Design an enzyme around this catalytic site. Structure first.
Site, PDB file in Angstrom:
ATOM      1  N   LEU A  35     -64.844 -30.958  54.753  1.00 50.45           N
ATOM      2  CA  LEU A  35     -65.459 -30.833  55.890  1.00 50.45           C
ATOM      3  C   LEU A  35     -66.830 -30.254  55.615  1.00 50.45           C
ATOM      4  CD1 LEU A  35     -63.158 -28.597  58.258  1.00 50.45           C
ATOM      5  CD2 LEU A  35     -63.381 -31.075  58.222  1.00 50.45           C
TER       6      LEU A  35
ATOM      7  N   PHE B  22     -70.888 -21.596  47.995  1.00 50.59           N
ATOM      8  CA  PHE B  22     -69.762 -20.118  47.449  1.00 50.59           C
ATOM      9  C   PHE B  22     -68.662 -21.058  47.160  1.00 50.59           C
ATOM     10  CE2 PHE B  22     -72.020 -16.347  49.669  1.00 50.59           C
ATOM     11  CZ  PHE B  22     -73.146 -16.482  49.113  1.00 50.59           C
TER      12      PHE B  22
ATOM     13  N   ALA C 174     -62.535 -25.933  64.057  1.00 51.99           N
ATOM     14  CA  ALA C 174     -63.415 -26.221  64.927  1.00 51.99           C
ATOM     15  C   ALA C 174     -64.020 -27.467  64.879  1.00 51.99           C
ATOM     16  CB  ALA C 174     -64.753 -25.331  64.992  1.00 51.99           C
TER      17      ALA C 174
ATOM     18  N   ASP D 249     -75.827 -12.522  58.281  1.00 48.17           N
ATOM     19  CA  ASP D 249     -76.130 -13.903  57.959  1.00 48.17           C
ATOM     20  C   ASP D 249     -75.930 -14.697  59.240  1.00 48.17           C
ATOM     21  OD1 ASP D 249     -76.920 -15.913  56.680  1.00 48.17           O
ATOM     22  OD2 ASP D 249     -75.040 -16.495  55.693  1.00 48.17           O
TER      23      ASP D 249
ATOM     24  N   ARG E  32     -76.345 -22.326  61.835  1.00 46.35           N
ATOM     25  CA  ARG E  32     -75.625 -22.991  60.952  1.00 46.35           C
ATOM     26  C   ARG E  32     -74.360 -22.370  60.770  1.00 46.35           C
ATOM     27  NH1 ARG E  32     -77.693 -19.168  56.717  1.00 46.35           N
ATOM     28  NH2 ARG E  32     -79.691 -18.984  57.975  1.00 46.35           N
TER      29      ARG E  32
ATOM     30  N   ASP F   2     -68.574 -17.679  58.732  1.00 51.27           N
ATOM     31  CA  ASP F   2     -69.002 -17.501  57.513  1.00 51.27           C
ATOM     32  C   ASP F   2     -69.372 -16.030  57.174  1.00 51.27           C
ATOM     33  OD1 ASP F   2     -69.152 -20.105  56.632  1.00 51.27           O
ATOM     34  OD2 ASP F   2     -71.153 -20.485  57.416  1.00 51.27           O
TER      35      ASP F   2
HETATM   36  C1  LIG Z   1     -73.026 -22.667  52.214  1.00 49.78           C
HETATM   37  C2  LIG Z   1     -72.247 -21.639  52.439  1.00 49.78           C
HETATM   38  C3  LIG Z   1     -71.073 -22.062  53.367  1.00 49.78           C
HETATM   39  O1  LIG Z   1     -69.813 -21.399  53.150  1.00 49.78           O
HETATM   40  N1  LIG Z   1     -71.307 -22.962  54.252  1.00 49.78           N
HETATM   41  C4  LIG Z   1     -70.132 -23.698  55.246  1.00 49.78           C
HETATM   42  C5  LIG Z   1     -69.790 -22.886  56.438  1.00 49.78           C
HETATM   43  C6  LIG Z   1     -69.167 -23.446  57.357  1.00 49.78           C
HETATM   44  C7  LIG Z   1     -67.981 -24.547  57.013  1.00 49.78           C
HETATM   45  C8  LIG Z   1     -67.085 -24.965  58.010  1.00 49.78           C
HETATM   46  C9  LIG Z   1     -65.891 -24.144  58.273  1.00 49.78           C
HETATM   47  C10 LIG Z   1     -65.465 -22.721  57.788  1.00 49.78           C
HETATM   48  C11 LIG Z   1     -66.065 -21.630  58.014  1.00 49.78           C
HETATM   49  C12 LIG Z   1     -65.539 -20.405  57.572  1.00 49.78           C
HETATM   50  C13 LIG Z   1     -64.425 -20.272  57.027  1.00 49.78           C
HETATM   51  O2  LIG Z   1     -64.115 -19.248  56.534  1.00 49.78           O
HETATM   52  C14 LIG Z   1     -63.150 -19.092  55.755  1.00 49.78           C
HETATM   53  C15 LIG Z   1     -63.881 -21.639  56.691  1.00 49.78           C
HETATM   54  C16 LIG Z   1     -64.369 -22.744  57.234  1.00 49.78           C
HETATM   55  C17 LIG Z   1     -65.084 -24.857  59.207  1.00 49.78           C
HETATM   56  C18 LIG Z   1     -64.052 -24.981  60.245  1.00 49.78           C
HETATM   57  N2  LIG Z   1     -62.971 -23.533  60.058  1.00 49.78           N
HETATM   58  N3  LIG Z   1     -63.536 -26.002  61.289  1.00 49.78           N
HETATM   59  C19 LIG Z   1     -64.587 -27.078  61.122  1.00 49.78           C
HETATM   60  N4  LIG Z   1     -65.725 -27.073  60.495  1.00 49.78           N
HETATM   61  C20 LIG Z   1     -65.947 -26.098  59.509  1.00 49.78           C
HETATM   62  N5  LIG Z   1     -66.795 -25.966  58.656  1.00 49.78           N
HETATM   63  C21 LIG Z   1     -67.980 -26.885  58.501  1.00 49.78           C
HETATM   64  C22 LIG Z   1     -68.342 -24.998  55.566  1.00 49.78           C
HETATM   65  C23 LIG Z   1     -69.128 -24.716  54.774  1.00 49.78           C
END
Ligand SMILES: C=CC(=O)Nc1ccc(-c2c(-c3ccc(OC)cc3)c3c(N)ncnc3n2C)cc1
Ligand SMILES: N[C@@H](CCC(=O)N[C@@H](CS)C(=O)NCC(=O)O)C(=O)O
Length: 284
Positions: free
Chosen positions: A20, A25, A100, A145, A149, A163
């Site tokens: 995704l 990190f 999401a 933070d 984004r 995040d």
């Molecule tokens: C560079 C720092 C960094 O971490 N960037 C980052 C920020 C968000 C996502 C992210 C998530 C996501 C967010 C928080 C989480 O906590 C454990 C787990 C997954 C996610 C989602 N749950 N569902 C659909 N799309 C998603 N995305 C794109 C990926 C990279």
């Protein structure tokens, strides 16, 4: 890693899928979790899984563990990305989280720039996130933070804060230490977080104001044309971002209150929620 059976999920019932996002990190992949909803133990749910990268460092693992623990302590809320479980024993660390489908808010907004976004949609987006921060602050948690984004959008256009790698308990800050707040993006940061090396909920309110500006610019980049290296000098001299076009005067005045130099003169998230609720209701 201490065992936490309340949150532990079996590895054999988890199937990793397409990636995704890939940051610094760790990495995030879509996955299918069978029985993650305990009332439907035979149904496979689509989820997101955050893990370490192949070039991960020791700090990356500590950040991931800290993020997991913070999401355990925070609790459940409609506008916060929901922690579903964790694989922590006998293998790589996986943090399983609600999926999401519409990605992060900045790309969502930038893509719907002239299913185009209306003023009501932007007010509804802001209200949801104000509510999410109000709950976080009620749990004595500082995000540190806050930015477009770091917001996710579900299939039903629900806004979720995400995040939590930098999030801390309000008392878990090394006040006045030179290294404190050194990993926060400068263009979203309250001035006192760097001038005084402290962080309170009013610092999060500043970031929320920057987030509001992002939302009403439909994903604009804050302080356009101003390099990070020059920003904080201008902020000391009173420079603030100008009003976006898609914004009312009242919402811009709310942004500027979030950006008060004196933290105690900024609004609280409870006041922001009340004002945004009034504005959103009147828009109907
Ligand atoms: C560079 C720092 C960094 O971490 N960037 C980052 C920020 C968000 C996502 C992210 C998530 C996501 C967010 C928080 C989480 O906590 C454990 C787990 C997954 C996610 C989602 N749950 N569902 C659909 N799309 C998603 N995305 C794109 C990926 C990279
Ligand atoms: N704090 C200890 C344990 C934290 C940890 O999980 N460290 C990883 C580094 S990637 C590790 O493999 N430590 C060796 C161990 O478990 O003893 C350490 O960093 O050595």
């Amino acid at each position: 890693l201490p065992e936490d059976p309340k949150w532990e999920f079996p590895r054999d019932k988890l199937t990793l899928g397409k990636p995704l996002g890939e940051g610094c990190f760790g990495q995030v992949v879509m996955a299918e979790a069978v029985g993650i909803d305990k009332d439907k133990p035979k149904e496979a749910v689509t989820v997101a899984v955050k893990m370490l990268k192949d070039d991960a460092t020791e700090k990356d693992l500590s950040d991931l563990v800290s993020e997991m623990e913070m999401m355990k302590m925070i609790g459940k809320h409609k506008n916060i990305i929901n922690l579903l479980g964790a694989c922590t024993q006998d293998g790589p660390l996986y943090v399983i989280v609600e999926y999401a489908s519409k990605g992060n808010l900045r790309e969502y907004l930038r893509a719907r720039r002239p299913e185009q976004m209306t003023f009501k949609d932007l007010v509804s987006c802001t209200y949801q996130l104000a509510r999410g921060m109000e709950y976080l602050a009620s749990q004595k948690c500082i995000h540190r933070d806050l930015a477009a984004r770091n917001v996710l959008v579900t299939e039903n256009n629900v806004m979720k804060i995400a995040d939590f790698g930098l999030a801390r308990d309000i008392n878990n800050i090394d006040y006045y230490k030179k290294t404190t707040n050194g990993r926060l993006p400068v263009k979203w940061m309250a001035p006192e977080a760097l001038f005084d090396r402290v962080y309170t909920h009013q610092s999060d309110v500043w970031s929320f104001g920057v987030l509001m500006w992002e939302i009403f610019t439909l994903g604009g980049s804050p302080y356009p044309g101003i390099p990070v290296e020059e920003l904080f000098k201008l902020l000391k001299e009173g420079h603030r971002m100008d009003k976006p076009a898609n914004c009312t005067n009242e919402l811009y005045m709310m942004m500027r209150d979030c950006w008060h130099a004196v933290p105690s003169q900024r609004p609280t998230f409870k006041q922001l929620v009340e004002d945004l609720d009034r504005i959103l209701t009147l828009t109907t």
